[PDB]
Amino acid sequence: YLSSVSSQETQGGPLAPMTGTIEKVFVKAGDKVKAGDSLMVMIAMKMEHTIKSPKDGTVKKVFYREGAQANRHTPLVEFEEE
Amino acid sequence: YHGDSVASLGTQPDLGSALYQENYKQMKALVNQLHERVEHIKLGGGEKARALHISRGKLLPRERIDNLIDPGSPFLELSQFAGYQLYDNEEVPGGGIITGIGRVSGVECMIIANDATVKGGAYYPVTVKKQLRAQEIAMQNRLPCIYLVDSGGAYLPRQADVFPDRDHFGRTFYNQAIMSSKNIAQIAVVMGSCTAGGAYVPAMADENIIVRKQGTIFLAGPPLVKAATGEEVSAEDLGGADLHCRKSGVSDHWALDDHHALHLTRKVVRNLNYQKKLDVTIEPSEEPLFPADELYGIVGANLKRSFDVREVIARIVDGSRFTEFKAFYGDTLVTGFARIFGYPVGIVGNNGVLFSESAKKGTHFVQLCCQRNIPLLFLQNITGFMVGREYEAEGIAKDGAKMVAAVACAQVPKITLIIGGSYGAGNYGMCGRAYSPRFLYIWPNARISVMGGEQAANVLATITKDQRAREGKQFSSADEAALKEPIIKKFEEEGNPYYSSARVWDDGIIDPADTRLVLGLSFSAALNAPIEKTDFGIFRM
Amino acid sequence: YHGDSVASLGTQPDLGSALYQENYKQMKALVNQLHERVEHIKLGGGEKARALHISRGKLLPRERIDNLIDPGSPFLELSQFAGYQLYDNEEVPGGGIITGIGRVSGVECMIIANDATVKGGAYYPVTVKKQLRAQEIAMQNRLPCIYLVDSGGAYLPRQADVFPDRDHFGRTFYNQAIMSSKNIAQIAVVMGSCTAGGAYVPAMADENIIVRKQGTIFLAGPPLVKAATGEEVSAEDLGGADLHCRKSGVSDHWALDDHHALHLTRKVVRNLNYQKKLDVTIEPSEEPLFPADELYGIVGANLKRSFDVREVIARIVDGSRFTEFKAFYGDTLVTGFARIFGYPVGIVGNNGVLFSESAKKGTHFVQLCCQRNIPLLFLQNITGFMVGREYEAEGIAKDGAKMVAAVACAQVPKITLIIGGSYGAGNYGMCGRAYSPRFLYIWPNARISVMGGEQAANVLATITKDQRAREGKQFSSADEAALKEPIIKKFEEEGNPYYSSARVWDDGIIDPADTRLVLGLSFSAALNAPIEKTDFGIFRM
Amino acid sequence: YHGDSVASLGTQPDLGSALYQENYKQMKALVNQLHERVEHIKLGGGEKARALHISRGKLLPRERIDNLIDPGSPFLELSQFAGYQLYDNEEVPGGGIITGIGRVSGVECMIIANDATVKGGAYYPVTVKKQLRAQEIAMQNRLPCIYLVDSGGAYLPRQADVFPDRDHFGRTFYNQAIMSSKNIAQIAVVMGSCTAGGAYVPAMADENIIVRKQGTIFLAGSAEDLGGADLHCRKSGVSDHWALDDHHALHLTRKVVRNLNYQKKLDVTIEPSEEPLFPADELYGIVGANLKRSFDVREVIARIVDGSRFTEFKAFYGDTLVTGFARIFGYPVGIVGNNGVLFSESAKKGTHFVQLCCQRNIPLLFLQNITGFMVGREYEAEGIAKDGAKMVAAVACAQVPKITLIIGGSYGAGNYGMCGRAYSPRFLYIWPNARISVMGGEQAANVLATITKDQRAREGKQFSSADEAALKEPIIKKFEEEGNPYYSSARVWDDGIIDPADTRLVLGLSFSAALNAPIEKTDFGIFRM
Ligand SMILES: O=CCCCC[C@@H]1SC[C@@H]2NC(=O)N[C@@H]21
Ligand SMILES: O=CCCCC[C@@H]1SC[C@@H]2NC(=O)N[C@@H]21
């Protein structure tokens, strides 16, 4: 729990903060990312939110593309099991 | 046993990132702007007025405070920007009065000194409000009040806004009488002329000190005496230290000069037979694990961008240690327990739009703090409430009201810090000025108004688009900005921190790097009064 | 000035004496019997149940307590023998629940943990009584309650003795609500399944912690949902789900495993903002001047023989220092002032049959202790079937009540230790279970009943000797033991310490060598609550 | 100004309807059964015991109470059925003790009289519990206690259930000492022999009266020489008053109460009393004896409140629960009654209502007819347990007087939320058709029919339908027997089984007694929002 490996375990995947349009996607289908790497930018009620990488795991897949409307708490990125 | 290892908040920001570079640059400019404006206010009336003031043998108002407080002790000044551009053609630096909290003879006291270099010390409408705010702070925290009296009376051209009403000049004496009845010492130091209502201040004080020749006290000034009775008498003869000290008896102590009077004041406070007692548990202080100046890059000046409030918390609490409460429920609101300079604090901060879950989570947290007598700190960065047909059907208003009602009834000391926007009912739920927080501070990037400037513009752009679509005369897009641009300008101007601070809506604009120090001083002062039991109203379940 | 030399109690026993050798041998056997029986109870349900419990990743109930309390701190377990042979064919080690007082984050707390290895954690009638006793102890001493919840619900075959009455399972939630209203923290950790009706325990708590995978909280189980609505749901999905932690909001903290949950619990207690304050004067502690194990030889196991209670006192009080009150008046009762681990204590102990003078002497002493707010310790050794027991008691009734009435109204903390017999009204006068002593302990040689076994036998031997002498059919001596032997067997069986302790009549059977330590821990816990003023009734002079 | 016209509850039932005819017939039989059983209990030990009792010059225990209370005043007896079939082969009518509330010299008092005709007045385990319940009622309502002492001591064969524990015989003296310290008068009238612990009762009383020859007091058991009125009155000094006979002692007791210098004061507003607009006996047809059928609780309310006037609170929200304000004999009351399964909305509505009554210091009346909580995956996801707990926690902390009446089923956690016995209601009564248990008999049967159907389906040996009732029939019989009102009342779980036609009178007497104590401010715990 102190090791912070737990911080990765607390949530399996990053979800959409609110229902909003996807304005930017910074990750390809297979991309190596480190914690704090921005994955997507979403505007909700004219308010910009940037999604950030939870783990250093490589990205297995992306559930949304640019211009898509993503509902609140819907998975945005799939990460390869390690 | 306190040896348990625990997790700590905060992360290292990306200093190389363009966003951090831009945010730091913008926030730094605001802080520099704030600093230089205070420097100008520091000079009061000006060189000619200051030279005249010293030529009479009197100390400058800020030098008086420096000599009054303990050597090297910090001084927490309040409402430095009162009266900033408030009046069309008159410059009133600091409102003509200097108020703050400092340590005298080891006791925290409220110091209220007239600035005689500003309009001769006349009382403008903002001057009365600033003094009344200081008295309210002193009473709520049981801080002895020291009045360095050097005043020229009320400003006649604006008498209707000074004399008559409940919160007008008359309330000043009412506050003195009430505090005296509660054993909150009232000490007046007449270091200049005081006329009409001014003469009441030394008379209403528990103990009083007057300078040998500078000080003068009289209900009616020489000009009124001549008009009423046709007699010519000097101010010293009509008032003066000797007359009051030896004949009238209004004076309790007689002082040779300003330095002597300040020395006497320190002796008076030392005889108050007061000792501070703490109701809360105390733990050794620890510095935060991250630099405070990083707040410049993290926060910036663009309210449209969002940041994690936990980053702000990580840089002000002891050791960056924070126990979050209901972390995964109502995540738009952050609540948890921490310590600042050893004091326990419950922190409530906005991290997005308020929802029904967020309001419920806040209401639960506030009850916990009140039960354990833990001071509360609010970090307002709001953008409104959730808007939707479903949310109203589920009683979002009912949930939002739950928090307004819990926050109002809480009796633990409350301090509010506006680090972002403050709009609509979100202000009330987060302990706005109307809810009597012990102190309220704002960062230089804050904005406050009934609603955001854009929302008012867009709302009107619906009403008149409707007005002409429904009426039938077409209303074009260029007609839209002849509607929207004046509204946005008005809300930007009236939501500016200086506009809010010029009037006394907050207790000051503070540099983000100074947030931890200001909070530490404020909470320390607020602990001078015992914490009472909280009585709640009906919780509309 | 505390430099005065004083006399000390106690004398060196004759180790060579045959009586001492026999008494030591008998008492030692009882202590060894007590130790090995506890060892068996320590194992709970058994190897198969324990192996299954660990196979699910859960800690054993006693390992949870070891990790919860401060490192190396003593743990005062209560009612270890609850349910010992209570039920005909079912073995319920410790009643299926472990209760005791330990230090968490430097704060004394009451810990109540279900033993899931015993009948899957089902609540037997004794289980409810043991928990209710623990809650009563926590409330009377203002000890925070920590519930390590892992339960299987009520035991249906015995529902009538669990559900309905005032002191039945429902009272558990009533106690939680009352303690919460008094600011006595209620902390629940769901470390396993919470069954129907146990889901309330997490909800009724001030702060709540639930384990990620193991914990399940549901008012209706998956089977009841399946019966009522024909719906099939996994336990994790129905309750104790991420749904309970986030969607439902019942959970305040989310824990990865048992170790994580225990770490979180320690953090929660550290944030209670509580500091212990003592109402009594304190003096440095000193060990008794005589070994404690000598109590084996002095006391023995034969209740017919008599010993000087002063010898017991000399081996438990600090420095064996004792100030006797009214030493030569009513000598069958011993009263005086002493100190245990620095705390002041007034000791009342039996030294023979109670007389009118003894009752008056006790009543006077109890008033003294209540006036000075001094805790009271009672050492019960009532005497039965003596020529002295066969005495006119009309005076004894008139004077005893005065002691029953003073003892009942006393508001100072009271602790009772039964070191011998406890029969009839003598039990009431010496602060029996009915008189709400903070704690009640018994030595392995004690006997308790309405009257001594012999007296009941002899009394019946008068009634039926009369029955047949007055009726006229002769009743012979062999007919006498067909009357007396069953009675003596019954009273011996029902007066046994294990019989008394299996039901919760006392808080545990303690080794005499541990008497000083147990008293020190108990009095220390009892001092967490402020001592109230004592209001007495009418003293029937 | 109180001249406003208002609406009234209640509707005229269809007397011709077959359902009403059947329900009336079934309920009437239960009431007749209740009446005749009480008649038998009225006789106590029996003719031989009663004849022996009178032959000694002593009054019968119930005649003593009749002479003690004010002429013609009603007497509220409690737990008439204590000990009913409780012990296998021993008949103990009323537990060997008679307890109730009556008016003495214009003051409401608790009267506790031993029945010497029943087992010579020996104390059975139920006898101690009944007395302890009476003392608890007296303390909570500040009612003076009068002990008509005629006892034979503890019942030795069952000593382990009488002597040792906290709620055992010892607690009786503890209660006397505590009430005395609170200025709640304790008066003992020794009208017979009292031995061992019995002798403490006169000694622990504030004022004491003993009969000339019948009474005897001694710690250790001729009896007159060892004890007796003369020895205690003149030499021992244990006796404060000396009485020639039972009639004289009762006359002296009335004088003692008149000198208490006590006057009743009311904390609540009072309005003139009015009878309900509908006959009470119609409750027979409306309610019946079949718990599976449902009825509108408002009909019950309309027939007990003054003028059948009722102000409903949150009528359309959480409709399975009914809450509102009314008045009984002029007293203000907040009524909470079940009208279906409890839901999240119902629990929230109840919690809101209880806070209102506590704020205004209004007594609360609960009408329990429960069938359980809503069962469903969605309801649990929405925190039904969290909502249900809100009500358990508000009800527990409420300090206004609380009275509970079980007019139907009382199962599971629904009992707790509706102020069960565990939540210290001032009084708890049950109708003759009520059922109480951890769960309904059918639910326990069906639940087991899932566990063992699973047991043998999962194990693989088939378990047939006839194997099902060899499982279900014993369970249903057990829950029916242990949920019976007489089973519940034989043990002291309630304060009595009352005829529905008497509901209004019993509530009026109970609330009047409960108002002898000042109403305290209510302190709540944390409301888990
Ligand atoms: O009204 C004109 C000025 C001179 C008369 C005013 C009189 S003097 C007595 C009284 N006190 C005042 O302050 N004003 C009036
Ligand atoms: O009665 C047999 C089992 C299925 C029906 C029981 C219902 S479901 C709704 C209500 N809540 C309970 O716990 N039981 C009843």
**Cβ of residue C227 lying under 6 Å from some atom of ligand 2:** yes
- C424, C396 contact by CB (below 8 A): no
Using beta carbons and an 8 Å cutoff, which residues of C are at the interface with B?
70-71, 103, 105-106, 183, 206, 245-246, 249, 252, 254, 263, 266-267, 270-275
The 8 Å CB, 24+ separation contacts for D51-54 are D52/D117, D53/D116, D53/D117
Contacts of B463 (CB under 8 A, 6+ apart): none
Q: Is the dihedral of CA B201, B204, B205, B209 positive or negative?
A: positive
Map residue C135 onto helix, strand or coil: helix
Contacts of B31 (CB under 8 A, 6+ apart): B296, B444, B511, B512, B513
Map residue B3 onto helix, strand or coil: coil
Chains D and C: 3 or more CB pairs within 8 Å of each other: yes
Length of chain C: 541
CA distance C284 to B121: 64
Q: Is the dihedral of CA C312, C314, C315, C321 positive or negative?
A: positive
- D506, D512 contact by CB (below 8 A): no
CA distance B426 to B442: 16
For residue C245, the chain D residue with the least C-alpha distance is D381
Enter the DSSP assignment of B95.
Answer: G
Method: cryo-EM
CA distance B397 to D362: 29
Q: Closest Cα of chain B to D521: distance in Å?
A: 12
Cα D316 to chain centroid, rounded: 33
CB within 8 Å: A6 and C256: yes
Enter the DSSP assignment of C251.
Answer: -
Using beta carbons and an 8 Å cutoff, which residues of A are at the interface with B?
1-2, 4, 17-18, 36, 45-49
CB within 8 Å: C250 and D385: yes
Per-residue burial over D171-201, b if 16 or more Cβ lie within 10 Å, else e, is bbbbbbbbbbbeebbbbbbbbbbbbbbbbbb
What is the enclosing helix (H) or strand (E) of B26? helix B18-42
CA distance B11 to D268: 61
Q: Resolution of this PDB entry, in A?
A: 2.7
- Kindly give the number of the ligand 1 atom that is closest to the alpha carbon of B228: 4
Q: How far, in Å, are C31, C69, C97, C153, D60 from residue C41 at the CA level?
A: 15, 21, 11, 22, 54
Q: How far, in Å, are D141, D411, D429, D433, D501 from residue D293 at the CA level?
A: 37, 16, 22, 13, 20
What is the enclosing helix (H) or strand (E) of B288? none
Rounded to 10 deg, the angle between the D384-397 and C170-181 helix axes is 70
Nearest CB neighbour to A47, from listed B5, B11, B304: B304
* CB-CB neighbors (< 8 A) of C259 in chain A: 1
Pairing state between β C193-194 and C216-217: parallel
- Which token pair is B27? 């926030």
- Closest to B281 measured CA to CA, from B529, B515, B527, B521: B527
Rounded to 10 deg, the angle between the D125-141 and D170-181 helix axes is 10
* CB-CB neighbors (< 8 A) of A10 in chain C: 254
Q: Which residue has the tokens 């409960």?
A: D514
Q: Residue B116 Cα, ligand 1 centroid: separation in angstroms?
A: 27
Which are the residues after which chain B is interrupted (C to N > 2.5 Å)? none
Length of chain A: 82
CA distance B203 to B217: 9
Q: How far, in Å, are B191, B238, B239, B256, B417 from residue B247 at the CA level?
A: 19, 12, 10, 18, 51
For residue D444, which ligand has an atom nearest its CA? 2
- B312, B298 contact by CB (below 8 A): yes
CA distance B372 to C269: 12
Q: Closest Cα of chain B to D309: distance in Å?
A: 26
Q: How many CA atoms lie within 13 A of C98 on its CB side?
A: 26
- Which token pair is B251? 């004076």
Number of other CB atoms surrounding residue B88 within 10 Å: 5
Map residue B448 onto helix, strand or coil: strand
* CB-CB neighbors (< 8 A) of B454 in chain A: 46
Q: Which amino acid is at C98?
A: I
Q: Please name the residue whose Cα sits nearest to atom 12 of ligand 1.
A: B228
For residue B195, which ligand has an atom nearest its CA? 1
CB within 8 Å: B372 and C263: no
CA distance C84 to C91: 7
B contact chains, 3+ CB pairs < 8 A: A, C, D
Q: What are phi and psi of B256, to 5 degrees?
A: -70, -45
Map residue B423 onto helix, strand or coil: strand
CA distance C140 to D166: 15
- B355, B395 contact by CB (below 8 A): no
* CB-CB neighbors (< 8 A) of C217 in chain D: 385
- Which token pair is A42? 């979403």
CA distance C370 to B535: 34
Number of other CB atoms surrounding residue B307 within 10 Å: 18
- Closest to C125 measured CA to CA, from C93, C161, C153: C161
Contacts of B282 (CB under 8 A, 6+ apart): B342, B343
DSSP conformation letters of D268-332: S--------SS-STTHHHHH-S-SSS---HHHHHHTTSGGG--EESSTTSSTTEEEEEEEETTEE
CA dihedral C257, C258, C264, C269 (to 10 degrees): 170
Which of D294, D375, D377 maximizes ligand 2 atoms within 8 Å of its Cβ, making it the mutation to test the pocket?
D375
Q: Is the dihedral of CA C478, C479, C485, C486 positive or negative?
A: positive
CB within 8 Å: B541 and D348: yes
Q: Closest Cα of chain B to C409: distance in Å?
A: 30
* CB-CB neighbors (< 8 A) of D197 in chain C: 425
CA distance A18 to B353: 10
Which residues is D365 bridged to in the sheet?
D335, D403
Q: Which amino acid is at D70?
A: D
DSSP conformation letters of D375-405: --HHHHHTTHHHHHHHHHHHHHH--S-EEEE
Direct distance between the N- and C-terminal alpha carbons of chain C, in angstroms, rounded to an integer: 40
- Closest to D489 measured CA to CA, from D415, D419, D406, D413: D406
Cα D135 to chain centroid, rounded: 13
Nearest CB neighbour to A2, from listed B7, B304, B352: B7
Q: Please name the residue whose Cα sits nearest to atom 7 of ligand 2.
A: C228
- Which token pair is B467? 């007005």
- B372, B402 contact by CB (below 8 A): no
- Kindly give the number of the ligand 2 atom that is closest to the alpha carbon of C220: 13
DSSP conformation letters of C403-443: HHHHHHH--S-EEEEE-SEEEHHHHHHT--GGG--SEEEE-
Q: What are phi and psi of D328, to 5 degrees?
A: -125, 115
Chain B 435-454, residues with CB within 8 Å of chain A CB atoms: 454
* CB-CB neighbors (< 8 A) of D392 in chain B: none
* CB-CB neighbors (< 8 A) of C254 in chain A: 10
CA distance D75 to D98: 11
CA distance B407 to B386: 20
Enter the DSSP assignment of B524.
Answer: H
Q: Residue B137 Cα, ligand 2 centroid: separation in angstroms?
A: 60
Nearest CB neighbour to A48, from listed B7, B14, B305: B305
CA distance C86 to D160: 14
Cα C410 to chain centroid, rounded: 20
Q: How many CA atoms lie within 13 A of B205 on its CB side?
A: 26
Which of B195, B224, B226 maximizes ligand 1 atoms within 8 Å of its Cβ, making it the mutation to test the pocket?
B224
